Structure 1
């Protein structure tokens, strides 16, 4: 299409599709109810991302938002994706370590706040206010990462995989606010095509990279 970022939307679509089919095949046969949990969550994440990447690819998950005196192309379908896939990723972490239910509700709710204020900021027409929504969203993000480091001694294989995915999680999640701030939704420093490439690389890593790590671990079996 006439959008230079199309190629990154098509590659992300393909890679999310392929990861989904891989995990679907892989979880074939699994009977341990525990492992079953991790397979369902982990397979669903790139399945949802597949649909939202394809809706961006086809033009559906795109809208124009007037601000700073211009019609800015905003991919809102990323927030419909993240709204469901980021809590699922947190649930994977939470289940690994057998979190208390209050801690899980804390994470899911802070996550909802994170993504929904990101979406409000994305669609806000007063330029300055976009960054107020960014800051609140970033603060929800920092609460989540705090809880992942200070809110949780289980068996050695659980701990190790959990420590690895936790570190993956802090590194990739932390890059999202930066990308948003310098890209088309924020300061407009980086063109939309580079921005879309960056989000594609983070999304595939946090979704398909993260799940490859988890699903190859025996940490997922009781």
Structure 2
């Protein structure tokens, strides 16, 4: 695989895991220090949700760096490395990111429950496909989890977009910027997953880990950078509970 064996344990992908760990930690501390001088009740809610997104990713990338949670999967006569921490990362951070967008749109708790429910179903069925032993099952779960992603993305571009436009041009501008970013970044995940080691095997584990790291830092540090610098987080919020 493309990369360099930093720890001397036969894993060239630790170079991209180490870089991702640094970028997540730097982004976590940057949002944390920037949020200490924040007294607005609503802005503190966004900082609380957003800081956790690279903070949890930092722990997952640190665990994947040291090899904690690494195991093998046999699909015929080939051996596939799977990092459990990667999916546990997405299981926690994707609901928080959707919560950030739901706070901007100010949608009801039933809307949020359907959103995070389908989002979690997308992640679990993605892990199930990564653990299956036949290629037919791996593509079948990938297709099911992709459909669930489309359902989540459709709700952001239709229901949550219309509700956000009623809250004024400032929130609508920030919500449109983030949603435009989410529609393209999140779509890149099943594309890489199906062309990487878990799918056709076109992309090795090295480049896939590097590309997954770039998507992760952009969907977390880049997403939070656009949100936390906008004036929309000062507007009134209503947490689902």
* TM superposition score category, shorter chain reference: over 0.9
Residues of 1 paired with 2:84 and 2:206: CA distance? 15
Coordinate RMSD, CA, aligned: 0.9
How do 1:14-29 residues align onto structure 2 when only pairs under 5 Å count?
A: 14-29=22-37
Tell me if 1:7 matches 2:15. Answer: yes
Please name the residue that 2:193 is paired with. Answer: 180
TM-score in terms of structure 1 length: 0.98
Q: What's 2:4 paired with?
A: none
Structure 1 residue runs of 4 or more that deviate by more than 2 Å after TM superposition: none
What is the TM-score normalised by the length of structure 2? 0.90
Q: What corresponds to 1:154 in structure 2?
A: 167
1:154 offset after TM fit, Å?
1.2
Say which SS state the counterpart of residue 68 (structure 2) adopts: coil
Helix, strand or coil for the counterpart of 1:53?
helix
Q: Secondary structure at the match of 1:146?
A: helix
Unaligned ranges ≥5, structure 1: none
Matched, 1:38 2:46: yes
Helix, strand or coil for the counterpart of 1:27? helix
- The Cα offsets for residues 100-132 of structure 1, whole Å up to 9 and x where unpaired, read as 111111110010000000011111112210111
Of residues 120, 131, 138, the one that matches 1:123 is: 131
| Counterpart residue number, 1:88 | 96
Equivalent position to 1:170, from 164, 183, 189? 183
**What is the correspondence of 1:58-137 to structure 2 with a 5 Å cutoff?**
58-137=66-145
Confirm or deny: 8 A CA contact 1:52 1:61 kept in the other structure: no
The reply on whether 1:217 has 2:225 as its aligned counterpart is no
**Unpaired stretches in structure 2, ≥5 consecutive residues:** 1-6, 161-165, 236-241
Measured against aligned partners, the alpha-carbon deviations of 1:186-205 in whole angstroms (never above 9, x if no partner) come to 11110000000000000000
Secondary structure of 2:173's counterpart equals helix
Secondary structure, aligned partner of 2:186: helix
Q: Give the length in aligned residue pairs.
A: 222
